[PDB]
Amino acid sequence: RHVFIRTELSFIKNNVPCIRDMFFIYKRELYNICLDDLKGEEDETHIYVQKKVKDSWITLNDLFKETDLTGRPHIFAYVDVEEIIILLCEDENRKKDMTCHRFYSNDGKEYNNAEITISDYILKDKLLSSYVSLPLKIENREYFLICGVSPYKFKDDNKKDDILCMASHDKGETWGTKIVIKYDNYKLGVQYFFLRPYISKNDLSFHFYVGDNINNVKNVNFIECTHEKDLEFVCSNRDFLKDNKVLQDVSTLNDEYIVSYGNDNNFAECYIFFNNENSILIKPEKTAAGCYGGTFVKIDENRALFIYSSSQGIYNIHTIYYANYE
Amino acid sequence: QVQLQQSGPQLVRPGASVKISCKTSGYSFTSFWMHWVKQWPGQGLEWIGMIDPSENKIRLNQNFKDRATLTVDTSSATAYIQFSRPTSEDSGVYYCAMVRRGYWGQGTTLTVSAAKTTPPSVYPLAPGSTNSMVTLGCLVKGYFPEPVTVTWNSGSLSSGVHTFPAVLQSDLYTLSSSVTVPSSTWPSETVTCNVAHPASSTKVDKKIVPRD
Amino acid sequence: DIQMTQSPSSLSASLGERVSLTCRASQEISGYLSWLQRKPDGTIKRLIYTASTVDSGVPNRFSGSRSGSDYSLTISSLESEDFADYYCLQYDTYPWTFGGGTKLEIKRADAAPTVSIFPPSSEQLTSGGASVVCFLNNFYPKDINVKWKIDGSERQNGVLNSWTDQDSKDSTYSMSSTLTLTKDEYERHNSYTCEATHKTSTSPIVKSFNRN
């Protein structure tokens, strides 16, 4: 009714090639957790914490130097008001324990670290993915969430064992709290990928991909969750599909949904809709680029970033402000 | 509950291929790099290298480039280090470890030598001439290789026993051990030193009789 | 390679004292420094990593710190368990490199050596050899000088010395000196003497015997 939108475009150069990006906001500053894993005879796996300074990423710390982990570990990063907690967990079954390396920091640069073990963890046989998250307040305590999803099911006797979360109330030291997710629209004979919780205004929701049998594409799904029992959430799907546009990412600004779309599965252009009304067009052409991988990074309830990698090493940062003027 | 059990001591001759094992349990063997560290005789530690069990990829200190070769068997969760053509320089204690986790094996002693295994000779040491305390001893001369153990009256006397480190001269070790007892119990009571050289399967007893 | 120079190489202190070991890196290692403890039984334990973080299960009397290129390990109150060997380890750049090590020993009051001299045994003499043994037992500090005299003339050829590690009970040291001659050259002389010079006495402790 009484809202306005402002956008600016900025660019960031990166000197290291990141196989995957994980952006987070710490004290209103943009950071990146960059997994660098070239497979050359001389190369080593790096997990850099980077910080935006001027128009370039500045590497602050290589977390991976502290661990003997092989492969590409799961990365679970959490931002509290003053603290950053990053977990590197072994990439996997027969074993019932998961070993993680916990990194802690009060600033963006200096990290303390130690090893933890989540013995007999209740996410056995669930698919885990890397993501950044916020604390979720249940009762009078705040929790960090590690959530997984069953990759595939033929028959589903219990619709509470499809999405399952492990929770910690001591800043990621111990993970003994089970949070039950009821998701009735979990489909049988369908493969699930890349489950990520989104937490905003102490509300829980999940963003993930679903594989398509007919066409060889992965479709974005988004479910919103309501808190019912203390440690139980029920989650239903939320439809964002629109014709001749492919759903990409979802976020919330000004207590409304903002949604990015691509024109096709190649993401030549990108459209961002605010409450499904006002839209802004992203043209990463001025060329040969695209807006694949575009994701929202929320700064506060009115300020958000939309980030995608134009070309190799270049990041397009669209800053979005959306609020009521009265 | 991580455990790293290495293989026992080995004595090989120069040029004979030798392999040391380190068997793991209590964790996913392929999820962590395995390191090898060498303890030099009478000196410090040196990092040999590390192996990735999941990729069979190796980062090796080039000081061991043509000396050590690292392997793994993921089916049995054991890491190996092998010296194909070992020399006397390769003697030392070898540790397997997940260094950045703090888990170390107990270590494996490797002795590379061409010297022939020789049984010791045990000689009494008795004074020639009093005081309230009398010091006895026995000399364990000309054996190979280490170690030998020496006890007194099958282990009865423990209060005042010293066993000196062996010294190596002409491919043979010599060692000495001393006991101090009151003049009341010697030679009024029996004092015998029990030497055991497991490498030569030698168990011999020598009683210390007073001199003329 | 990155050279880690560690000091002091040897240090003595009493129970409950505070000691500080320093490790200097030849180039920047960015705080990737670890401290390890090597106990007498060969087992190796990690104490500190990332310069100042104390590993779990390590007592709170251990700590680490950094000032520029210098990294230090501090033990605020020394306990009996803490006397062993210590190594720093940089794990910043391959190959990883250790410091030369620090041997930490216990400090106690001075104690004079108990000196005993033993003639060669007739067991050994009948096989051509002749070993004269001299025990210098339970002294402190560790430094001491033994000298052999045959008919009043100093002899150095054929002398072998062995030094015990610090005793776990009384925290003293001991040394054995063995003068090995053939039977024939041993018979050509009469007086045999070993003299021990030590901090605890202005004049040396003289023990001797005559072969008659």
Numbering used by the authors:
A (entry chain A): 2 to 93, 97 to 290, 294 to 333
B (entry chain H): 1 to 129, 133 to 215
C (entry chain L): 1 to 212
Study authors write:
PfRh5 forms a complex with cysteine-rich protective antigen (CyRPA) and P. falciparum Rh5 interacting protein (PfRipr). Within the β-propeller structure are four intra-sheet disulfide bonds (Cys19-Cys35, Cys90-Cys92, Cys151-Cys169 and Cys229-Cys239) and one inter-sheet disulfide bond (Cys274-Cys298).
Additionally, we have determined the structure of CyRPA in complex with a Fab fragment derived from a monoclonal antibody that blocks the growth of the P. falciparum parasite to understand the mechanism of inhibition. The structure of the complex was determined using diffraction data to 2.44 Å resolution by molecular replacement using a homologous Fab fragment to obtain initial phases, followed by iterative model building and crystallographic refinement. The antigen interaction involves residues drawn from all six complementary-determining regions (CDRs) of the Fab and buries a total of 1634 Å of the molecular surface across both molecules. The shape complementarity of the interface (Sc = 0.71) is relatively high for antibody-antigen complexes, with the surface of CyRPA epitope being predominantly negatively charged. Comparison with the uncomplexed CyRPA structures reveals only minor changes in rotameric conformation and relative disposition of CyRPA residues at the interface. The absence of large conformational change within CyRPA upon Fab complexation rules out an allosteric mechanism of abrogating a complex formation with PfRh5. This suggests that the PfRh5 binding site for CyRPA overlaps with (or lies close to) the antibody conformational epitope, defined by residues within the loop between the second and third strands of the first β-sheet, the loop between the first and second β-sheets, and residues at the N-terminus region of the fourth strand of the second β-sheet. In addition, in the presence of non-inhibitory anti-PfRh5 monoclonal antibody 4G4, the PfRh5/CyRPA complex remained largely intact and was eluted as a tri-molecular complex in the earlier fractions, with free CyRPA eluted in the later fractions. These results suggested that growth-inhibitory mechanism of the monoclonal antibody 8A7 is likely due to the disruption of PfRh5/CyRPA complex formation.
